[model samples]
Target: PTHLSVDTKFKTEGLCVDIPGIPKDMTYRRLISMMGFKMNYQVNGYPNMFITREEAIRHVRAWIGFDVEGCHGTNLPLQLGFSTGVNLVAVPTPLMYKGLPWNVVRIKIVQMLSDTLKNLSDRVVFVLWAHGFELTSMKYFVKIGPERTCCLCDRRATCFSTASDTYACWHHSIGFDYVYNPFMIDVQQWGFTGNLQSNHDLYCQVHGNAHVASCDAIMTRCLAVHECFVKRVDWTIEYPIIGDELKINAACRKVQHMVVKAALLADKFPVLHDIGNPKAIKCVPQADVEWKFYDAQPCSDKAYKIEELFYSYATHSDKFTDGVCLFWNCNVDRYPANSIVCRFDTRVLSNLNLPGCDGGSLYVNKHAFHTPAFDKSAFVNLKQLPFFYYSDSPCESHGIDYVPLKSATCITRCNLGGAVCRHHANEYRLYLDAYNMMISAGFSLWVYKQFDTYNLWNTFT
Candidate 1:
């Protein structure tokens, strides 16, 4: 009841509780509006209120096998017990029960009740039966992951069809296990690509490290890629990867905080509204699990556009919270030109091998893709950052070119690798240019060039 009162006050921003003890001058509506919700006042009062606060409190206490003594006021102990009995508590966070298996949540629930019920034999049956009424009476409580039989996971894991509902392990579906325990899946042992390992150990590991150097780039990536509008009002990007990267570190900080916040909101969106909180933002930065971001082949297989991805994140409130993890365009190479591209994140990568590739990357298309206020002009790695490569010397002749800052700068950089390149309108068409030209001659290439090894940057043309 206290919690509900508090939540309700919060509901009507600036509202306060209308208690009998407080000053009568403290107008109920005004106080509620001023202080926001402060107590957990339930609708129509606490359960069995028809009997009386004392009578209702007594039965509820006995129901949960909790002792009541001393305190008179509202019988909080009894209130809390009844709340728990009715599953009125908020959904547990991802971190709360992190490693408990999906198959074990029900067993754990039963065990927890065992400790609370006095008549172990009879109370257990009572509890089992009471839960049905409780659920029917309070159906809104089940809003964390999804509607699955025995589904208590904070994220999606494995899912199956059940008679009552579709059973899904929110734990697995949400990708927590993938991020934390990626090593469990082995490529050789599993006879497939180590998807989970690639995510946590590889994609996350690399992007995480790379972001260290260009955290600003990541922040921009988050905005352009994930469509997050979180900005560090007063900050700057520092050099050399550690403490200097201004927005990068700041964005990382934003992401870390927002993910937990957004996910919590997304997880609870069904039953409640997280409105007017100072830390509140509409969308989550979910992208790592999308299909277009995956590495399916034929390049044209997915055909999911960036605009479509943005639309989902922009329009859907729950989906907005879905994006705390870094979304990637994981491009993988399968045999016989067989490629599947799906939206993926570090979590999905942490679980299973989609194809043969463990990790993947993307081509930023810097020149063609311009982000507002991000000033990507200087960070034009277009094909450099996301462009991935494997040892296939036959296709090495193809390469991508950067859109040179044409107005003033000279041909300051020269390619020492002597790969085929061309200049495009406002940008240099290096890899894409090469790919288009080569594929015309029946050739396929992985990526244009690995920027980390390029010597052309220092060589003045």
Candidate 2:
């Protein structure tokens, strides 16, 4: 019943709560507003006022929980009991408590609850689920990292730029994975043929002594490449990779503080107005269908565009997120846009190998491509090679009669001795390098100047 009164006061702006010792003038609304301080967190161009407290008895009894009264007088089914579920008390930003200090309000609420709920088991645990103005106020409770700190990792960031607003983490800066996959073996080696020596010298200076494993080096490089250039931001990329359990919790706290500060700044405003509104973005299973505006080719034995690979997989799976496919374009081998090119997600591409040469069976016209971005640029390789070599029978290039391995592995098993092993590995590497370019920054394929050294002709033509 006491909880009911406090909840009602927060709901009704002018509503009054009748308590024994508390002053009648101390309305719940005024108390909460008074508890808040100038945190600079804002909503709709308004300032965010944060409140803190040592004890939560008074405020806990009054301010917490989800109960709609007045027009909607129903309570949600509370998840309780030993076998049922743990009841969580989620506190949103006190947007309604506009003028109050949050510090005092929280302590008072904590104190009020601690008295009646003597057993800890009976008390509802609190979790901060902040959004909007409340999210901005989190910095007051946690620590914020230095500007150089990686937003995704704890290590000091080293990606430098002259532009103030163009700050990037070391991994995401310049699209280079200095620590892993040095220029000699990496695709960028081919892309920047003239500048390879300078780039290699620079890489050795920074990451030579890092002493990380080859697999670890390549993995981080792959992650950095994806971070530097991507067409769309998804849930997977939003969170950083942290291995330790304790470190994961710590990272969560860091993100909370970072986001709170981010909310205050005007630069990170939301593009959609009704983004958080339940009515605006409700999930309905029936209405959840893929967009049908675009038409694409199905899995065919003949040539297919890179974009068609994604579209075809999406059609079969009902979504594109799980498509295990690689895409490549040989046009624009070395160019300005090459800087934006990235490595493939080796983790996804490692286990299985596509049957055909140069990435897979999927091949597209270099001039007229599937991806809209590549179509705009009228560019091809420096040597002007065909969209693919072995054009007479492109699919037959990796057949049982033509090649040794049918389902090729991503990593090379070759001892780096024979030309056949090198050719097999080189073809696989081309797929990884070129497919990465096609999706991320615009497609390109790199060709070796001395084609005979690594048996390039065997695979190329």
Candidate 3:
């Protein structure tokens, strides 16, 4: 009755519905018993939303401690108590029977509205909008109280007077409530924003003596800000070591990582596809690049400078087996967070690790170093020292044997391919320069992935 509002509209029909008067009364102990059940009923989402006749009875019983279970009893004592409670809550009207049942309440409200348009006829009911609870989940029905006010200010912190004001509600002041406020008004407003800046400067100055720490500060601040710009702003920013900083954009980053990973392994390990001897040579520093925007067709950006990525293997001779190691240097930041992929086509026929082989020979790519079908026991005797393995016998081992544990750098490719060997395109070079510039700004890093094709299946078609 308190939260509900009634609406009035004029109609063509002469329809008048009269309100009814009350009847009589009935006891105490009987009422509380019914109220006990009503307590549970009030929590029912829809029932709580609207007060029904049964709800009215329960309210009366709760107040007067009378038994409302009997028929036509009217439960006078309970009704009288409910009337007192209503007035106590500032509701002047002692509603009939403490209030109509949920269903009758709705019907009576409709009758009241129809009376306003009594002269109108055949006016079919049409709901432009309905305001009521449609409980899909309990979460939606939870109650939320008014926001608490700040001690210093009369208003909520987040609901400050101006848009430029810090993002606090009265209940959430930085100084009084929170340890660190992400948003606080400027110093003039008695906010903590200035305090945080001062603290940041002091911490950086005292701890900035170490080169690594200083560099990281510069990188995380200026460089990270620029990286954030590339993310927040619309521009064709790219990085050499990172291949393409454009790949960092939310929409393109994941897909680009997959493509680059595929390309890296495609070229590095030389997939022995039985095509027309199609060869996947090392990825040229530069490659044709393109992008697609929201719902827009993909467009190719002009060619840019390429950064070369290669695997350098060091051999320890006179050992039991030939030592195989893979090393790559790219123009991109090869941080553990930035996993990358390289793509290329290959035409090699024999295994790169074992050289030429007949049948039943294991083909070792420069990376994985072993074919999936190769016998695990094959490397038993023809061993190599200081060689890294992806796993032990039961995949229970991790150490220098893991290639990722080895040193890797982030970078890009730039050199282009040719017609049978030597024709270079220079038009796309500036875009390449732009990319490299960002790289210098601390955007490039080694990708977090070891092999490119591992997650190829998951990339979208």
Candidate 4:
């Protein structure tokens, strides 16, 4: 038994119950095991916090083999020794401390609490404001151990000593224990309260290199850190490619070598979406204009999925003929059939070996170009090219095949009932600039080929 203490006068107080008739000779550790939230409350502290017999049992079970000892007695008959090949004296057999079995004790505690509160008096719906560290410990029980030390480069790193209110180890020491939510610390209000510069210093030390611009920003950095330590193998595809693979392993490296990694990074960071867009029209020398494909949504997951498909096809040729190519093509709709065709500058396609459509000028449907493979049987489409000019033009007025020059300037309507067109030029140099950027970043090109059933090679155009 334990002492009983109850106080209910304070504003924050509700029901306060304690048991206090325990033996004085009981060890402190054993007393701690017997006690729970109910025995540890003070006025103006927790209101609903309490412990029952079930909680006490669970706490005891948790320390089974480690601390709580079982009965020790002889299994042998009296005076039985060498004849039975057994020791006459008995030794204690440790109780197994495996994790909580099905129908966990914590669940039982929840049910008990609910039933007890629900049966209160004639008619009553009780509300409680329970608070205590024991609640968390009991609900999601984990064996407590010695104080955690720093894991960054050293074990005996400096730490803040709460007892003496001083530095015990290196001033910059950080604990290895996992931080569930590093954002809990009020970043704005974190000021000089003690020896450290501010509370923000602790967050900064753990979230190294990640700019604390927003909540998502810090989350992405933490994810990267977790990925580096825990999920290291996921980054490696067959034959991983590092820096400048185009020059290093030009012949062996495929499209997955660079584009897949770029997509992965884009998925992880917010700044990547702002990198590329032709129509954004912010393509000044000061602006950071990167290359993008059609239907490039800045914040959508589909954009990365499209890029992933591109890399997937580059690695597996059979996937192309097996109807995988049409899967992604059907999802993104840049434009409708027989729409205005925008042509990229022919200069870039020279070494790339693309098809010649209409007067050495490449015509694109919507924003994609259908090109024949090496053998001319199957076709791979190149999409997301910069549109320089439309196919339907008023340059040649009233001509069946070729139109005669109509106006001084190419004054074609931008579209039906649209604004009058003036001039079109590479103001931002998006296509060429992005192409060079990808090449410099070690992106290797892969040829797309159409195939037949059974994954047989149809031909290369």
lDDT of each: 0.23, 0.24, 0.22, 0.23
RMSD of candidates 1 onward, in order: 25.1, 26.4, 29.2, 25.9
Rank candidates by lDDT, best first. Answer: 2, 1, 4, 3
Residues 18-78 of candidate 1 have per-residue lDDT tens digits of 2224443433234333323222343433211112222212222122211111111221211
lDDT tens digits, residue span 350-392, model 3? 2121111111111122121111112223222222211111100
Winner by lDDT between candidate 2 and candidate 1: 2
Q: Residues 1-461, candidate 2, lDDT per residue (tens digit)? A: 21212212222211222122444344333533433423233332112121222112211211122111111101221111110111212233312222223333333223333332222112222212111122223222221222344444553442323333332333344432211100001122112323222433332222231221221222223222222222121222222122232332343233222222222121222221111112222121122222122223222222334333334442462332321111122222222211111111111211011112112221111111112122223323222212221111222233222444333222222422223343554465454444333333222332212222223223332
Worst 10 residues of 2 by lDDT: 77-86
Residue 13 of candidate 4: its Cα lDDT? 17
Query: lDDT of candidate 4?
Result: 0.23
In candidate 4, what are the lDDT values of residues 1-461, reduced to their tens digit? Answer: 23112321112111121123434343323333443222233343212222222222112111100001112112311111110011121121211123333124323322322232221111111111211111222312121223334333333222332233322122222221111100011111112233221332333333332221122223222232222212221212122122233432232122222232222222222111211222343212232223233333221111123333335443552222221121111222222211111222323433122122111211121111222111111112533322121212242322112222222222123322343333221211322344454444322232222211112111111
Reference-based lDDT, residue 337, model 2? 16
Please, what is the TM-score per model? 0.17, 0.17, 0.17, 0.18
